[PDB]
Design a protein around this ligand. Structure first.
Ligand code: MN
Ligand code: MN
Length: 190
């Protein structure tokens, strides 16, 4: 790995795409952690063989994980954490064990407050159109590096919605770097 993508998701938007059943995210109104994804030459490293998920190793972080890393689409929170560890976390296990991996993600969330960066500019979520350049600009001004913006288009209306914001980090998991990939067009609903 040569870097990490720290991905946060916007629950209300993510829930809108799940048209089959109920969804907790509608009740959640803040950015939550989707996951911490190790990267290699521009691609996400996934499903690396490694240690099985051990719930006891993060029992001391439960209160923080239930509020910052709740599941939006899956059955329950624990299942989501297990999924993230098995699909992404194992790929950086050589340097970060399970406890360290989850702690790092929690720290990143506490240090990267997206809503706080957007409020002053009245660019917070309000169901209206926002511009990609402006949002990226507001985050860059506060944190120092460009974030990555991820959008999804509704199959029916064809409208584009901001669903995730990515903060890019070097292999040390501490040095913020510029992200260089968005999946959002010039405008989107947020
Ligand atoms: Mn995933
Ligand atoms: Mn899968």
């Amino acid at each position: 790995m040569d870097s990490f993508w720290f991905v946060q998701q916007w629950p209300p938007a993510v829930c809108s795409f799940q048209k089959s059943g109920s969804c907790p995210g509608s009740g959640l109104r803040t950015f939550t952690i989707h996951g911490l994804w190790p990267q290699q030459s521009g691609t996400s490293l996934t499903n690396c063989p490694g240690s099985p998920f051990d719930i006891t190793k993060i029992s001391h972080l439960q209160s923080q994980l239930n509020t910052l890393w709740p599941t939006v689409l899956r059955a329950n929170n624990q299942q989501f954490w297990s999924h993230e560890w098995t699909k992404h976390g194992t790929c950086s296990e050589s340097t970060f064990n399970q406890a360290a991996y989850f702690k790092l993600a929690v720290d990143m969330r506490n240090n990267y407050d997206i809503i706080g960066a957007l409020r002053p500019h009245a660019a917070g979520p309000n169901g209206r159109t926002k511009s990609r350049q402006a949002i990226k600009g507001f985050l860059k001004a506060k944190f120092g590096k460009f974030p990555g913006l991820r959008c999804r288009t509704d199959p029916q209306t064809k409208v584009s919605y901001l669903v995730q914001v990515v903060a890019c980090f070097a292999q040390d998991g501490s040095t913020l770097i510029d992200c260089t990939r968005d999946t959002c067009g010039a405008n989107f609903i947020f």
